């Protein structure tokens, strides 16, 4: 009721600070990406379009700032009530589609490292068109409504009944197309990334154990340090053979263990000098069959060193963390619209926490630039 006025008077100032922070940071991001990076990779095109969508949304943000400040007294008219809400919904849809495409591109780049810039631009245009199409409900049904006989006007959503089933659809098309289907694609594209990293790390971790113990054999001539070092090498050779990133990889390690078994043979008798001679041959086998598969493991793990992967992970994680309040509360509204819940408290919590969730959901719009300078060590110099 009127008690909510005290908290809600601070909503417009949060909108204003978000607007200024975003309109500065995302503009800087645009100029940085276009100039110091020159859009030389596919990951740059998607991020630049994310920044452009942020610009487009933040341009129409201050209308809602005064709309909440004036306590729902939208004066800008119908031609802006039908475009500001459209801009908000389009921002949501375009941002989530761009994030899904970014995650798919990261998976393809670090799991399948095999002109795509033009393909990126085409996909970007398709994403913008699809987001504009999904913003059609705000294009059509959003309309200025005169409250009572007074002169108060609100950018109300006109559920014209007896010709529309949408009330169920709109609350669900957001929760499905804007958060659910994108989540499955992104989670799948990042679980597959983890599997490819785990296989690459296992080969690198086990081959390290071969390297350190190989150094131990040369430096020690105790006739038992060779046994201890060789035993840990054979166990590492077997483990690395199972870290599949086909016959060449298996045949490459079958000979490798055979040399360790040969070296372990004379370590038993006491021929220390002959022990490291057989262990020295391990380098020859490595350079032939294993080094080819050893560079890919480091190359794949080197993609985590890229600042792009750090930035995209931060952007994707925050977007779905900040949208989990509103998307959950949106589903609650959908259930309450069909009569599933008939609780005053449920209706009250949905109708009073939703103002905060919208601010929370679009809070990420002014935090995308802050993820560039925080994790983009290169971006700091710009």
């Amino acid at each position, epitope marked *: 009721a009127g008690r909510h006025n005290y908290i809600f008077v601070m909503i417009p100032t949060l909108y204003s600070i978000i607007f200024v922070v975003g309109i500065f940071g995302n503009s800087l991001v645009v100029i940085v990406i276009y100039f110091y990076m020159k859009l030389k990779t596919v990951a740059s095109v998607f991020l630049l379009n994310l920044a452009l969508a942020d610009l487009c949304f933040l341009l129409t943000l201050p209308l809602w700032a005064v709309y909440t400040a004036m306590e729902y007294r939208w004066p800008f008219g119908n031609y802006l009530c039908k475009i500001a809400s459209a801009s908000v919904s389009f921002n949501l849809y375009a941002s989530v589609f761009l994030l899904t495409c970014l995650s798919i591109d990261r998976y393809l780049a670090i799991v399948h490292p095999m002109r795509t810039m033009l393909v990126a631009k085409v996909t970007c245009i398709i994403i913008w068109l699809l987001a504009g199409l999904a913003s059609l409900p705000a294009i059509i049904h959003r309309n200025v409504f005169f409250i009572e006989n007074t002169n108060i006007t609100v950018c109300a959503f006109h559920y014209e009944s007896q010709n529309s089933t949408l009330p169920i659809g709109l609350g669900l098309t957001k929760n499905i197309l804007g958060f659910l289907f994108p989540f499955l694609i992104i989670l799948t594209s990042y679980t597959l990334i983890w599997k490819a990293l785990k296989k690459a790390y296992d080969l690198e971790d086990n081959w390290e154990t071969l390297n350190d113990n190989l150094k131990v054999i040369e430096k020690a001539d105790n006739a038992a340090q060779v046994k201890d070092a060789l035993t*840990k090498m*054979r*166990a*590492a050779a*077997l483990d690395a053979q*199972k870290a599949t990133p086909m016959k060449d990889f298996r045949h490459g390690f079958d000979i490798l263990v055979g040399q360790i*078994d040969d070296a372990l043979k004379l370590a038993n008798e006491g021929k220390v000098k002959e022990a490291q001679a057989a262990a020295e041959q391990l380098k020859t086998t490595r350079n032939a069959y294993i080094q080819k598969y050893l560079e890919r493991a480091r190359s794949t793990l080197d993609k985590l060193n890229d600042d792009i992967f750090k930035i995209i992970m931060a952007i994707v994680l925050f977007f779905f963390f900040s949208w989990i309040p509103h998307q959950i509360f949106t589903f609650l509204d959908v259930l309450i619209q069909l009569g599933i819940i008939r609780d005053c408290r449920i209706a009250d919590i949905v109708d009073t926490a939703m103002p905060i969730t919208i601010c929370i959901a679009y809070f990420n719009n002014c935090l995308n630039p802050l993820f560039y300078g925080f994790l983009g060590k290169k971006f700091k110099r710009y």
Partner: antibody
Amino acid sequence: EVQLVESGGGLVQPGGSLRLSCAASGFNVVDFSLHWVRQAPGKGLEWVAYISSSSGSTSYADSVKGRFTISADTSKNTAYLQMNSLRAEDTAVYYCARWGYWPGEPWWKAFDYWGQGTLVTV
Amino acid sequence: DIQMTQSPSSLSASVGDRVTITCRASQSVSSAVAWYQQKPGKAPKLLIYSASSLYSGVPSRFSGSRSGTDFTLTISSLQPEDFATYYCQQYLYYSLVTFGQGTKVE
């Protein structure tokens, strides 16, 4: 089918000698390693020694190294083991087992076919 | 000298129960762990080689898994014939063979 049969068991005073022989059938010693696993009465299994006929290799347990002499004969498809300077701990049921060579799967199968087992008392 | 330790000294269970035996190795032995089953008065029989692969001619009750250095043997249904001493084994190298201590399911 592939089977392993032991022999040479008996009763002897400590410090005696026995000729525990591990005969093989079905397979050949030239493509398998004939180990020797023993367990004291009521105790767990303990490794003793092995022969690599193809590679001419041999090894022994730490409590057995320098005590028993092992050998193999591929002509008769049988293994051998010599007991020297027996002790009270040496009494056990001696199982001869077979184990494949590293290149391929037969290595991963461990001791897949064990012998019938022979009893040695001191 | 990889020491192999078996946790359940003497597992007690009834017919139809699902039993597990846990094996821990001193060092890392990769997946080179085999499981045996010594009925009393008879030679041991191999059940699971490579710590996860069932042997030929063995009922599918026995299933083995490896979690780093932790090797476990699982019997889905404890039939009355599966009452014997189960022995761990690690076979990283020919001269590095060390067995467990024995878990007799009673």
